[PDB]
Amino acid sequence: RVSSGRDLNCVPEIADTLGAVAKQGFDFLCMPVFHPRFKREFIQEPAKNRPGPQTRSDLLLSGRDWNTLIVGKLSPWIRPDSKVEKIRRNSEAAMLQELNFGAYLGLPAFLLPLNQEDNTNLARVLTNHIHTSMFWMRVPLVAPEDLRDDIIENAPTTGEEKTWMWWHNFRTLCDYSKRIAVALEIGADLPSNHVIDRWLGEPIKAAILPTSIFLTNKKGFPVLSKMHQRLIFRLLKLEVQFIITGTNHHSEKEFCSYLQYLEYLSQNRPPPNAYELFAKGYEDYLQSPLQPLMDNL
Amino acid sequence: APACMERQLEAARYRSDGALLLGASSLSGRCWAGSLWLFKDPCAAPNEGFCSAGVQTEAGVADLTWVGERGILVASDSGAVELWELDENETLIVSKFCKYEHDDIVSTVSVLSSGTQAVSGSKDICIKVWDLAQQVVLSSYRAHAAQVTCVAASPHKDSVFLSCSEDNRILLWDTRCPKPASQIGYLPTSLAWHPQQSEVFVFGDENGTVSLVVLSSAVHSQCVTGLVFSPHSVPFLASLSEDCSLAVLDSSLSELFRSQAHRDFVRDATWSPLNHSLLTTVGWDHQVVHHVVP
Amino acid sequence: ESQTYEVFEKDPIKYSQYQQAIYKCLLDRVPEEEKDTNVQVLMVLGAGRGPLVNASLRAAKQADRRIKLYAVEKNPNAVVTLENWQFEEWGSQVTVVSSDMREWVAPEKADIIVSELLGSFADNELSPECLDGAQHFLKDDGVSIPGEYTSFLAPISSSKLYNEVRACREKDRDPEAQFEMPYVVRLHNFHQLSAPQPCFTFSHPNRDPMIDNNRYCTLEFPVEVNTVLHGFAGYFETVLYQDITLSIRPETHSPGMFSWFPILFPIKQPITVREGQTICVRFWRCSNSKKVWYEWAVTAPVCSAIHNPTGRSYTIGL
Amino acid sequence: ESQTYEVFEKDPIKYSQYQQAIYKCLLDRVPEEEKDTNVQVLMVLGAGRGPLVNASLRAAKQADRRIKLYAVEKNPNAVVTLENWQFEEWGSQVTVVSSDMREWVAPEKADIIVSELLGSFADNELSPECLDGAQHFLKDDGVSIPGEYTSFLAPISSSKLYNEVRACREKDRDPEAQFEMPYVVRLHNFHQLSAPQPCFTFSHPNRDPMIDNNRYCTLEFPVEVNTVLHGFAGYFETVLYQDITLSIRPETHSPGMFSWFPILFPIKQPITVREGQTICVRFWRCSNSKKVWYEWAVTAPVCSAIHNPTGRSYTIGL
Numbered sequence A: 001r002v003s004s005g006r007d008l009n010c011v012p013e014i015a016d017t018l019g020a021v022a023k024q025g026f027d028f029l030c031m032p033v034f035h036p037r038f039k040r041e042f043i044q045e046p047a048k049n050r051p052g053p054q055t056r057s058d059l060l061l062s063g064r065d066w067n068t069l070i071v072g073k074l075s076p077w078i079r080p081d082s083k084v085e086k087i088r089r090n091s092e093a094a095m096l097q098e099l100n101f102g103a104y105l106g107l108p109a110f111l112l113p114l115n116q117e118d119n120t121n122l123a124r125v126l127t128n129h130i131h132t133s134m135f136w137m138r139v140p141l142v143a144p145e146d147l148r149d150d151i152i153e154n155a156p157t158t159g160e161e162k163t164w165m166w167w168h169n170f171r172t173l174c175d176y177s178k179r180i181a182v183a184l185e186i187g188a189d190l191p192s193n194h195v196i197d198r199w200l201g202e203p204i205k206a207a208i209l210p211t212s213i214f215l216t217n218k219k220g221f222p223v224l225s226k227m228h229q230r231l232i233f234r235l236l237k238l239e240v241q242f243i244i245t246g247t248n249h250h251s252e253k254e255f256c257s258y259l260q261y262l263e264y265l266s267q268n269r270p271p272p273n274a275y276e277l278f279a280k281g282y283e284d285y286l287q288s289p290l291q292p293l294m295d296n297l
Numbered sequence B: 001a002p003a004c005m006e007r008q009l010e011a012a013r014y015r016s017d018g019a020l021l022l023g024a025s026s027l028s029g030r031c032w033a034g035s036l037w038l039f040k041d042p043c044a045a046p047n048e049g050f051c052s053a054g055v056q057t058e059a060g061v062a063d064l065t066w067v068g069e070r071g072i073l074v075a076s077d078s079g080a081v082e083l084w085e086l087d088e089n090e091t092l093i094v095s096k097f098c099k100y101e102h103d104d105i106v107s108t109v110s111v112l113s114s115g116t117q118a119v120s121g122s123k124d125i126c127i128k129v130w131d132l133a134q135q136v137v138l139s140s141y142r143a144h145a146a147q148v149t150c151v152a153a154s155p156h157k158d159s160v161f162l163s164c165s166e167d168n169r170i171l172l173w174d175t176r177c178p179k180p181a182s183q184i185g186y187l188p189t190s191l192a193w194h195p196q197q198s199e200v201f202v203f204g205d206e207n208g209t210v211s212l213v214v215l216s217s218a219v220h221s222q223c224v225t226g227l228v229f230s231p232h233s234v235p236f237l238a239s240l241s242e243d244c245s246l247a248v249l250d251s252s253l254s255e256l257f258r259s260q261a262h263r264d265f266v267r268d269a270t271w272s273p274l275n276h277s278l279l280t281t282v283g284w285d286h287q288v289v290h291h292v293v294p
Numbered sequence C, D: 001e002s003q004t005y006e007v008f009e010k011d012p013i014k015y016s017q018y019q020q021a022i023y024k025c026l027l028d029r030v031p032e033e034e035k036d037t038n039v040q041v042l043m044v045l046g047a048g049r050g051p052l053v054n055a056s057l058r059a060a061k062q063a064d065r066r067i068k069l070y071a072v073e074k075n076p077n078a079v080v081t082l083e084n085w086q087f088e089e090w091g092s093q094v095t096v097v098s099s100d101m102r103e104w105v106a107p108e109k110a111d112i113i114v115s116e117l118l119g120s121f122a123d124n125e126l127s128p129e130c131l132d133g134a135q136h137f138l139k140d141d142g143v144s145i146p147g148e149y150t151s152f153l154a155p156i157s158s159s160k161l162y163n164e165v166r167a168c169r170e171k172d173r174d175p176e177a178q179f180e181m182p183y184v185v186r187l188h189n190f191h192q193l194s195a196p197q198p199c200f201t202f203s204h205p206n207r208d209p210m211i212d213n214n215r216y217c218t219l220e221f222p223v224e225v226n227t228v229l230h231g232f233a234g235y236f237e238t239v240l241y242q243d244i245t246l247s248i249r250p251e252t253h254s255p256g257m258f259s260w261f262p263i264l265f266p267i268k269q270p271i272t273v274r275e276g277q278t279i280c281v282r283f284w285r286c287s288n289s290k291k292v293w294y295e296w297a298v299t300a301p302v303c304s305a306i307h308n309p310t311g312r313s314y315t316i317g318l
């Protein structure tokens, strides 16, 4: 079937939460390793010597559960490309700390955001870490500034390609590393079409779907528009994992219904021909050409 | 009431008759949850045995407000806005409603002049307006481009509030209009209206600088976390920061008092209504410190 | 990683032995008449996730005496686990410290110190360095556990292993470096050519102004068959307290103790030996302020080159 | 080696400048009325074979005051030369010390300290580290010479140099490491694309609890021609005492001062630039308890990779 997960930012008890998650039919959960509102000081006193423990323990789950069911997340207050030196230094230290705790837990992947143009020092810190798990970069199709409403009188509203340039420059700085991949966020309005084709070729491992793009059917079930359906069809080929984020606005319907809609979409697709079938297991597998004159087969 | 209290204390608010409201959350260890507390005798805090009422929340407390006399509004880690009311004899605390409308953490909450509506802001960039009698959202406004840090209501008009963000904007709102928001260095962090005047307010910055709206002063080393005005007929201004210090300023942004009592982040300040010379502060070191101010 | 610590904690023989040794030491240090006055200060140095700490508490109970525990660990991720288990269970008995042995300013003095810094060749994880950097906040009538450890070496022949070494070649380095570095390996298809003989020995505490952990040894092994020489295998024995001991030596192995495998030192070129001849070998243990390493060479019956000069292929970082 | 020291000692401009600065400092520190009571304690840290020591004696004579010299050198072979010259000439004025700045227990406090720990890029030989490890046996009204130094960077184009780098490849390492390390070189056939701008700056003594010698800088260079980018060249200026200065900057070079050549930082792939565009570049200065290094990258007009992460190709050992 298709694989999907749940994105959260409030996990009071880890075991109960993971249980409910798996119950609704989710395969993995993405969650913070530290508390998101718990800023740490490393350089200056007296807060430098805050008593521990600084986080919850590893012995709450099992090694294989860590290894298979949990994706990590970086805390929002961490901003390495700030213009205030102090904040930037603290952010560097905290970032390394969280990444190393992730390594200690044996996590299969870790989520990191791109929400602006300059992420040079972030790339530096991560590049240091690597030369010492996969890393999923959270990057949207549309920038949040090009996404707000026209309700400010003295600052009016109006370029489809800036968010791709962000990712491209990042990956160039990191030197086209294998352990670095895309996590594409999707929203209500969609860009053109040559664009969507541009995100072809890129190492997309996951797609993020908010609850706010699902319309409601006459019966009260969740559905999607047709352009969204087209895009989903195209993504299903690359074989990505989908993540649901946000609140259940259809409080009548549990998350299981979203997932069943997704499975329904997957099932009703133009099945694979004889080629596509034969071509199973060879996608992007390099081979040396045959020489039936110099060699014998 | 709960057996133990959480170690991180975030909010502290006096009411008219002198009672004290406290808010705590757990940020480390096994369980990350919250609790609320009422102390009629504030000098007996933070002892869970000498409280008058207390309750345990599902999740963490980020902010809270008195709603007149009986009500408590809470911003939550869940992404919910929560209303509790006290029992007739102030012996218990009970939930009135719990609406999940934000898609991420609710960072800040403020009540409006009339005492019947309220505004909420989140890390999901949406601002909403609530009617507290009907339990609905009247409005969702997505104007900012990043996380919202502080909203502040005006004490003289029931349609005007302020909003700040990590995108470096400060907006003035009036819902009476069709385009409600209007615009006005370093990032802004905290806000406060002047009680007397109806056009003046203060704001704090990422670097350590306070400003009257111009006028400016460098007060702390780290981020300004809060700003509160004294109830004096001519008010003083309390300033609390991340450098673990407190300061009280006069009407000229000149420093009058400074305290290093705390060993960690200071989170809130509240002036007592009985004695206008007294000020209380809380923090993540689990201290409730009482200050007598000249 | 957490998995490593998990695998470590699964062998109960070693922890039972540690427990017994602690029990015995405390019975011998504190008479039966001051049971309720003399509190002994213990220290676990290299506490990890805290099985030694628990073994110590168990042992003090067993003996029915009174102790006071300090735990020192320089890895913060494990300190997280320790502080949780402390808040939930241990309590005030136990004080956690996040620091290196060699930099910590102790409040008071200890009666006993306890460590698990032992690898397959005894000293190859740097127990002497660390415990020497720690011996000053141990008092005069102080005890170390372990107090003694010894390593062993023996010769072997094996084409399979030689070819597995051949295969450990990798780009961007000397094409003979894989022969100049040791390996931990469960030996199976191989032939041993002569009994094991002792190499280096350490004892704690070291009450000498001339602390030199550098060493030089020479060994001669008689042969009784024609064959080839492909390397040397290593073992070790330790004395925890008097009669409590641990060994991976194949003649005196401890039953059911599977924490450690043997260690293999290789040579570049195989050496042909004949019956009655005698293999001789030299080993050095060397040092600077930054690093420790080993060097080895065969002298008889034919000479070899010196393996790993200046640590050009293998170093143990301080 | 002795030859290196010989070549160093052959530029008299620098030593005349040092002499003048010392003269001035002493005239300003000791009034004309206590000439015969106040003895000033000087220290040469990094004394080598002792031209600074002689310059200091000359200067004290010139000023007609009284001093007391300590010399510290961690190389024993040069200490031989120093002790000979001491026994034969200097006498009791001068006390020789064989030690590292960072480990020496001084008898008393100094008034002035003097150092020559400057390379082509100012800080690339580790003057900040050392002088910070030395500032505690300097007193409150103490003076350092130098007190200030600053580095500079500018862009260039040159096929010849790029091909000479291409050629510095060698076996048993990464085939792109020669692009991730700097070089000292007398630049000749090259084109400079824009003026030099300041990079990092240090000042001594450092009266701050937060001693951080780590640094981050960003720079933007305007262009006025179409061309290629092949690297960045480096320079430096220093302030010895007030108005006495030294520079290798091509706009303010000191006359006849040929001790230092420029330093070249390269990039892996050339970058094409057009008129009106703007090159931006980032540099970092990084550290651990063992090593110091640099990292650099181009952002505009096109992005490059980060050069030399974790010091994988160039390190300056402490």
Ligand SMILES: *c1cnn(CC(=O)Nc2ccc(C)c(S(=O)(=O)NCCc3ccccn3)c2)c(=O)c1Cl
Residues within 6 Å of the ligand: A217, A219, A221, A222, A223, A253, A254, A255, A256, A257, A258, A260, A261, A264
């Ligand atoms: C949890 C899990 N599954 N269900 C059943 C469910 O998901 N039903 C569902 C989903 C989506 C749609 C659009 C409908 S419908 O009836 O509007 N159209 C039929 C499409 C469909 C989907 C899946 C299977 C078959 N047919 C119904 C739940 O109700 C929960 Cl709560």
